[PDB]
RNA sequence: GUCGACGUACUUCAUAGGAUCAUUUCACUCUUUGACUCUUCAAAAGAGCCACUGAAUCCAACUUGGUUGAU
């Protein structure tokens, strides 16, 4: 379609089925960041409220993250790659919200923590240590 | 200390006959063993993560029937 994605639907022998697909952000992006010290995976967030982690290499395979009606868009992002694989290491704010969510770089899946301002404001800036 | 001769005790010094063994179709019932699946006297992980779909169990909610008696 016009939404920057191809999807293969196959009639498993009767309804069809989502077989395999490739796509991306339908709307242009808002904030990106480099995830590795080896120039392989980039982290990307847009205004159509999806979240994709792309590769850079010759394949151009990529993977949309797991958010698990979309979430509000990201205005402030921060990333560290020091403790990958163990717990969450990506910190995201959202427009007009009061809590900053976390994210795992390893499992491509959302975090388990919501972060409070404790002053009833909006989250304007995020940061992590080394 | 050693050797000569006397004594006592010890053990050991028998290997008979004859056999044997090497060389001269069709079906039913029952019995034994092994394999597959699962489980009891028990720890792990990987090919580890996210998707769309399928099935089960429990608690809540809804209907049916029940003191002229459900369990």
- Neighbour count for residue A25 (Cβ, 10 Å): 21
Cβ atoms within 10 A of the Cβ of A87, count?
12
Q: What is the DSSP letter of A35?
A: -
CA–CA dist A23, A26 (Å, integer): 8
Chain B positions with an atom below 7 A of a protein C-beta are 49-52
The upper half-sphere exposure of residue A38, i.e. CA atoms within 13 Å in the direction of its Cβ, equals 4
The first and second tokens of residue A47, run together, are 């205004």
Gap from A122 CA to B65 C1', Å = 59
Do A97 and A122 contact (CB within 8 A), yes or no?
yes
For A93, other C-beta atoms within 10 Å of its C-beta total 23
Q: Which residues contact A84 (CB under 8 A, 6 or more apart)?
A: A105, A106
The DSSP call for residue A86 is T
Q: How far apart are CA A76 and CA A53, in angstroms?
A: 16
| Distance measured from the CA of protein residue A78 to the C1' of nucleotide B61, in angstroms | 45
Q: Which residues of A95-120 are buried (b: 16+ CB within 10 A; e: fewer)?
A: eeebebbbbbbeeeebbeeebeeeee
Considering only the C-alpha atoms of chain A, give the largest distance between any 2 of them, rounded to a whole number of Å: 58
Give me the residue label for tokens 């077989």: A19
Q: Which method was used?
A: cryo-EM
Give, in Å, how far the C1' of B6 lies from the CA of A95: 131
SS3 content of chain A, % helix, strand, coil (to 5): 0, 40, 60
Distances (CA, A) of A66 to A36, A116, A118, A121: 19, 22, 28, 27
Q: Which of A92, A62, A74 is nearest to A27 (CA)?
A: A74
How does DSSP classify residue A68?
-
C1'-nearest nucleotide to the CA of A67? B50
């Amino acid at each position: 379609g016009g939404d920057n994605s191809l999807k293969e639907y196959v009639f498993d022998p009767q309804p069809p089925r989502y077989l395999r697909s490739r796509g991306g952000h339908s709307q242009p992006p808002s904030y990106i960041a480099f995830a590795d010290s080896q120039s392989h995976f980039m982290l990307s967030a847009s205004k159509d409220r999806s979240l994709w982690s792309f590769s850079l290499r010759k394949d151009a395979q990529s993977q949309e993250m797991s958010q698990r009606s979309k979430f509000p868009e990201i205005v402030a992002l921060a990333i560290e790659n020091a403790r990958i694989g163990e717990w969450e290491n990506i910190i995201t704010a959202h427009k007009d919200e009061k809590f900053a969510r976390t994210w795992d770089m390893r499992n491509k899946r959302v975090g388990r923590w919501t972060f409070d301002t404790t002053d009833d404001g909006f989250v304007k800036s995020v940061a992590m240590s080394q």
